[PDB]
Symmetry: C3
Subunit: 140 residues, 3 copies
């Protein structure tokens, strides 16, 4: 098991811009503050999105397009280093009433989004290709 230790100090609440990508805005914020490791959470609504699941056998993602407004029922994830820059790994649950979709988040157009960011001060984990899963998991 890989263990990454950190200290917490700052906290951020963000109001994302309407009509822009959710993931892209967070990453822009991260770059601006120089945050390389963090825990992410959010709620709100999106105008559309692109999610997907990971085929654990073929070792590839399978995405789904959703071109309908949905509530961000749940949004959670983390920040780490990939290709020399802060990289967001986020999972979500979008929908309304009994209509629920979930998976790895690729993109989402924001309607109204409030994001909580908890930066983690310490060695930022780096994502490297992992043979076993076919994903880019933390190494050191």
């Amino acid at each position: 098991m890989k263990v990454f230790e950190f200290e917490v100090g700052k906290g951020f609440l963000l109001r994302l811009d309407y009509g822009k990508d959710l993931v892209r805005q967070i990453e822009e914020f991260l770059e601006e503050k120089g945050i390389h490791a963090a825990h992410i959470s959010a709620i709100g609504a999106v105008r559309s999105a692109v999610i997907g699941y990971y085929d654990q056998e073929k070792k590839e993602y399978v995405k789904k397009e959703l071109m309908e407004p949905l509530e961000i029922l749940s949004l959670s994830g983390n920040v780490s280093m990939k290709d020399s820059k802060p990289f967001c790994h986020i999972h979500v649950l979008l929908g309304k009433d009994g209509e629920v979709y979930g998976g790895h988040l690729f993109s989402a157009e924001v309607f109204a989004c409030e994001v909580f960011v908890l930066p983690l001060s310490g060695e930022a984990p780096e994502r490297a290709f992992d043979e076993q899963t076919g994903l880019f998991l933390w190494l050191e």
Copy 2:
């Protein structure tokens, strides 16, 4: 994009009272401690609830009543200032097995609820009417 910066220090785990409203109990706690900004998370189960989704075009909420015991599969949100008092904005996923419902949380009767409250020390965001969404979003 609006950015609100804070420092973290305290942490709270609460055991809510059976038969009382989930949102109301948290709000009472916040008033007592004078918490104006925070991140919220909870798990447990409820005896009933009122959730809803936001029609992004008509600009109004559409609620759903659930008068059946449900598990709190996911509860996340934040605290901010609205009408000069701590205001909770929470989204949830309630249900059992494959029966899942989700949305903006209005009310929930508690069965057993464990809440994690992470107060945020800094300028609390205030909610003001936003023309674009018809929602009450953070101004400053």
Copy 3:
């Protein structure tokens, strides 16, 4: 209402081992570090899992087995003391696309899992049998 106060300081991001139980790995980590109270969060995917819901009348859990790879759409919980050792209480949402399952988490074989652990420094809550719900809730 019961209130447990804490101070936050450290933060941990863990990369769980493939093919091992999710809950057990976190618990081994908590024991090694001596964490008696904390907030938990995670995302990733599992190869199989066992969840369930609580019948609030009969006062007993009803389990559900899932022997199919699933994405961890949402994983949230807390750590506390039970039987004199760190005990995890976790709720999850597993699935893909519109196939979503949710409930109290009993076990899950890890495919790839990134866990965020926020230890809470203070008097750790202890779980004791509660007549009203039939669950083991926090006392003091």
